[PDB]
From Swiss-Prot:
Gene name, Swiss-Prot/TrEMBL: birA
EC numbers on record: 6.3.4.15
pH profile: Optimum pH is 7.5-8.0.
Main function: Catalyzes the transfer of biotin onto a conserved lysine residue of the biotin carboxyl carrier protein (BCCP) domain of acetyl-CoA carboxylase and converts it to active holo-BCCP. Forms an acyl-adenylate intermediate. Cannot use GTP or desthiobiotin.
Gene Ontology CC entries for this record: cytoplasm; protein-containing complex
GO molecular function: ATP binding; biotin binding; biotin--[biotin carboxyl-carrier protein] ligase activity; protein homodimerization activity
Organism: Mycobacterium tuberculosis (strain ATCC 25618 / H37Rv)
Domain BPL/LPL catalytic intervals: 14-197
Entry superkingdom: Bacteria
Name recorded for this polypeptide: Biotin--[acetyl-CoA-carboxylase] ligase
PANTHER family xref list: BIOTIN PROTEIN LIGASE, BIOTIN--PROTEIN LIGASE
Activity modulation comment: Binding of biotin and ATP significantly increases the thermal stability of BirA and leads to the formation of a high affinity holoenzyme complex.
Note from the entry: Identified as a drug target. Inhibited by Bio-AMS, an acylsulfamide bisubstrate inhibitor, and analogs. Bio-AMS displays potent subnanomolar enzyme inhibition and antitubercular activity against multidrug resistant and extensively drug resistant Mtb strains.
Length: 260
């Protein structure tokens, strides 16, 4: 751990803005802060006060009260992760389509690190590698916006955050460069968001091609603490998980997947 700190230099905010903001780029604003409770909470607070957060990026070197799905947490230590939130205007898109945005986010994350490295997307949005959770995605709503949060373990050690975690460094990526990764990440997200906004079928085909969950036997932990065990067959037009339970189709809009 003490050694991993020597592989955690800070992000160059100036250089990242030079790469990501400007003509042709959807990103309107990027800031790197030293510390916050939750980048999602922060962009949601901005929007609740009237700010236009469409194409706004907030990166945090450290995150002390990270949020997960379904009232869970997200652990981080300083400079170990890429922790960021982006604002996406969604009010132009019918509400039944908004869950795709979270699927698209996980695809963006997976694609931006895949070349550096059992690996793929667990439905809905989380990125697994060698069975460990490599990145967490969390989208929340602040009309007319969705705030899309990513926490990507770059040099983060499982013993620092969670027993089931993995990171680029634990997958053997030598000394991962968070500036390079964050630029690849935010360029991938931009295209994926544009794809979502325009109902591009390539989004669904690329998600299916990256899914670890489709085809596998799963147990799905439903909101409310009921479990269903079936075989995940597909996602539908709303990105809902289609389960085969001994012949019957069960379509799940929210849940925690365990692969069996
Ligand atoms: N470091 C870490 N590595 C891997 N596993 C980790 C971890 N820490 C905790 N766990 C486990 O993962 C479970 C939660 N799983 S989840 O389904 O809720 N996934 C959704 C995750 C949300 C993404 C966070 C982003 S960061 C930018 C923005 N700002 C926020 O506040 N949120 C978003 C927990 O209970 C622990 O067991």
């Amino acid at each position: 751990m003490t050694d991993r700190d020597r592989l955690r230099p800070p992000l160059d905010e100036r250089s990242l803005r030079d790469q990501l903001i400007g003509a042709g780029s959807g990103w309107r604003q990027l800031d790197v802060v030293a510390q916050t409770g939750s980048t999602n909470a922060d962009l949601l607070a901005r929007a609740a006060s009237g700010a236009d957060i469409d194409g706004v990026v907030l990166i945090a070197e450290h995150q002390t009260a990270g949020r997960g799905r379904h009232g869970r947490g997200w652990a981080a230590t300083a400079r170990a992760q890429i922790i960021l939130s982006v604002g996406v205007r969604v009010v132009d898109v019918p509400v039944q389509a908004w869950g795709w945005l979270s699927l698209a986010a996980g695809l963006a994350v997976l694609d931006s690190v895949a070349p550096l490295i059992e690996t793929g997307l667990k439905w809905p949005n989380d990125v697994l590698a060698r069975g460990g959770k490599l990145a967490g995605i969390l989208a929340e709503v602040a009309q007319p916006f969705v705030v899309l949060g990513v926490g990507l373990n770059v040099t983060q050690a499982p013993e620092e955050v969670d027993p089931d975690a993995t990171s680029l460094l634990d997958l053997g990526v030598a000394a991962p460069d968070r500036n390079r990764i964050a630029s690849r990440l935010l360029r991938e997200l931009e295209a994926r968001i544009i794809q979502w906004r325009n109902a591009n079928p390539q989004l669904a085909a690329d998600y299916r091609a990256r899914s670890l969950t489709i085809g596998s036997r799963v147990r799905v932990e439903l909101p409310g603490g009921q479990d269903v065990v079936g075989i995940a067959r597909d996602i539908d037009d709303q990105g809902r998980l289609c389960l085969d339970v001994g012949g019957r189709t069960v379509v799940v809009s929210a849940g925690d997947v365990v692969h069996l």
